[PDB]
Symmetry: C3
Subunit: 161 residues, 3 copies
């Protein structure tokens, strides 16, 4: 999982990639892990719930509908995720506490930073197929991320034998 | 560190907010002040006239229709705004002389830098309600700007705790 | 690297200019050169064929239609262009190997990085007028690029062409 997205894409042409239109807010720019999808819209109740779970080196892919109106994740939630073992969080939307996010040694990608907090109701769906920028994000897939963007693979890269 | 867009957003749910989708070109990443508005399109004679007015504790929000064709503010106006005391300028549009803007100790946000200068016929409106990226910006509101974005309050923070 | 896009824009009002909406991936954000154009869609065989020629202080302007699905340029080709003397490559589309690109001392502007390499079927148009962000880019023109944006002139400034 330490190969580059560019090199692995070359080996796995069928693997779906996403351009780096996200800003790297976290301490780690390169990260990877089994994906877990979440779809919401200006409400992060489910985001907090899911990250409180055990990370186990997985990557949370949040699809906030690309909205920049509210932040789906902040410093507090970022630190929790890190203490829970998550490799990283990818947000198709906004986040906040830019200064605090940079301190957390995990992957944190988002379209932009935005002031307001999201609502805390709980609308949204977990572990469901996603569609971000014309690409399918499927539960159980392995996400790879670096400076050149993201790569979703059906199985972690190998090389052992 | 001091006031923040985020904290104050929590304390003031009625405030309007804009994501940090502007590039920071000024010497100050963080600034705030009483809002002064302006609407123009590829013409900045009004920008020069208004920034010449005393801007102590104020923030000029320039709605350029989002155009990136011409610059509404260059090195000269940036320095002028500073000499006149402006706390900052927010441009929904473009600016130029980025190397010079960076050296002026005022806040300066814009969508992008561009080479061409703006016309100077003087078309535009002063201190009128603006609608930027879905958010209404009003002359007389208080603006806060930092790395997390822009917060617009109907008036500055009211001491209902000890200050904010 | 020399003459500023802002100063020359003032001097040559008729010239065409583009805002700095590109990310500077190369080791030099300032560069200039005679323009060579190319319009392709997620295919980079022609881009490779072109940059494999003597660069001689020219700038290649690739119009990938703005797509960010595949990279029109990688590290090997970027370094190749550099060794061929190309002054820089402007890509209205995406590139990859950003880590390697930062190490290539020529202009390398693009909208974004993306993992997928492009197809190599070789389709596209070489040295034809281009239409990037409402501005026309003509092959033969002289391009200047810096932090303030891109300026296209009919001939190099009153300097000595090649680099400004
Ligand atoms: Cl100016
Ligand atoms: Cl440079
Ligand atoms: Mg009151």
């Amino acid at each position: 999982m330490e190969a580059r997205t560019t090199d692995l894409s070359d080996l796995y042409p069928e693997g779906e990639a996403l351009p780096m239109v996200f800003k790297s807010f976290g301490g780690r720019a390169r990260f990877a892990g089994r994906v877990r999808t979440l779809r919401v819209f200006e409400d992060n109740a489910l985001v907090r719930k899911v990250l409180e779970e055990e990370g186990a080196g997985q990557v949370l892919f949040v699809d906030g509908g690309g909205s920049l109106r509210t932040a789906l994740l902040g410093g507090n939630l970022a630190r929790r995720a890190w203490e829970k073992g998550w490799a990283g969080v990818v947000v198709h939307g906004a986040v906040r506490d830019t200064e605090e996010l940079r301190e957390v040694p995990i992957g944190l990608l988002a379209l932009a930073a935005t002031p307001k907090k999201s609502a805390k109701e709980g609308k949204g769906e977990v572990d469901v197929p996603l569609k971000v920028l014309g690409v399918e994000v499927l539960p159980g897939s392995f996400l790879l991320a670096d400076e050149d963007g993201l790569l979703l693979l059906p199985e972690p890269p190998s090389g052992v034998r």
